[PDB]
From a paper:
CXCL13 is the cognate chemokine agonist of CXCR5, a class A G-protein-coupled receptor (GPCR) that is essential for proper humoral immune responses. CXCL13 is an agonist of CXCR5, activating the receptor, resulting in downstream calcium signaling and ultimately the chemotactic response for which chemokines are named. As elucidated from structural data on many chemokines, this conserved tertiary structure consists of a disordered N-terminal region (6–10 amino acids, referred to here as the chemokine N-terminus), followed by a long loop known as the ‘N-loop’ ending in a short 310-helix, a three-stranded β-sheet and a C-terminal α-helix. Furthermore, we were able to utilize two of these mutants to solve the first uncomplexed crystal structures of human CXCL13. These structures allowed us to observe that the core domain of CXCL13 (i.e. everything except its N- and C-termini) is fairly rigid, whereas its N-terminus exhibits striking flexibility as well as a propensity to form both intramolecular and intermolecular β-strand interactions.
Upon administering both WT and Met CXCL13 to these cells in a dose-dependent manner, we observed that both functioned as agonists, albeit with differing potencies and efficacies. In particular, we found that WT CXCL13 had an observed half-maximal effective concentration (EC50) value of 2.49 nM, whereas Met CXCL13 had an EC50 of 26.3 nM. In terms of efficacy, we defined the maximum activity elicited by WT CXCL13 acting on CXCR5 at the highest concentration tested (1 µM) to be 100% (defining it as a full agonist) and our negative control of buffer alone to equate to 0% activity; our receptor-independent positive control, 2 µM ionomycin, produced a response of ∼119.6% relative to WT CXCL13 (data not shown). Using these parameters, we observed that Met CXCL13 had a maximum efficacy of 86.8% when administered at 1 µM, classifying it as a partial agonist of CXCR5. We were able to solve the crystal structure of Met CXCL13 to 1.88 Å resolution. We utilized the structure of CXCL10 [chemokine (C-X-C) motif ligand 10] to perform molecular replacement and generate an initial model that was then iteratively refined to generate the final structure. Further inspection of Met CXCL13 indicated that there is one monomer per asymmetric unit that forms a crystallographic dimer with a symmetry mate. We next observed the specific interactions that allow the formation of the β0 strand in the Met CXCL13 structure. One set of interactions are the typical hydrogen bonds formed between the β0 and β1 strands to create the parallel β-strand interaction and the four-stranded β-sheet. We also observed that the initiating methionine itself (Met0) was responsible for helping to stabilize this unique feature with both intermolecular and intramolecular interactions.
Author numbering: 0 to 79
Write the structure that this text describes.
């Protein structure tokens, strides 16, 4: 899996947000676009293994919990 963070100032890419759980095993990439002057909200786009591309609510509990896993394994992926 690949996490991409775009430190850009472009217009919003998402017109809706989904809060539906996406199991990590189905995720090929996650793209995070922090908000800025181009888009007034943080966007999180999940690229699923079946090629679906899903804008996700960045305040959804399941994505927050996932992001904590990704943060804590960003220097070592060893499960300790």
């Amino acid at each position: 899996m690949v996490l991409e963070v775009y430190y850009t100032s472009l217009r919003c890419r998402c017109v809706q947000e989904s809060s539906v759980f996406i199991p990590r095993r189905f995720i090929d990439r996650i793209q995070i676009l922090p908000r800025g002057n181009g888009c007034p909200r943080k966007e999180i786009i999940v690229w699923k293994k079946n090629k679906s591309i899903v804008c996700v609510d960045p305040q959804a509990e399941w994505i927050q919990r996932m992001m904590e896993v990704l943060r804590k394994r960003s220097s070592s992926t060893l499960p300790v």
